[PDB]
Design a protein around this ligand. Sequence first.
Ligand SMILES: [Zn+2]
Ligand SMILES: [Zn+2]
Ligand SMILES: [Zn+2]
Length: 68
Amino acid sequence: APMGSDPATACCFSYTARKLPRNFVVDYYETSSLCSQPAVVFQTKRSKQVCADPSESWVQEYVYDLEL
Ligand SMILES: [Zn+2]
Ligand SMILES: [Zn+2]
Ligand SMILES: [Zn+2]
């Protein structure tokens, strides 16, 4: 899951290989450009924080859905 728990500095070294159901995703943040790779981290109803590849369409669609 990300290394660290502060959205300002936590980094992802892998991405989820499963699609998260929209009904279980409740929040997100973007990882810092200081991290080795870009990532969105989604928080879920099971209290997980899940790294995801921002180049995937569904990740972008969920981010807009949460933000706006
Ligand atoms: Zn939040
Ligand atoms: Zn779409
Ligand atoms: Zn904001």
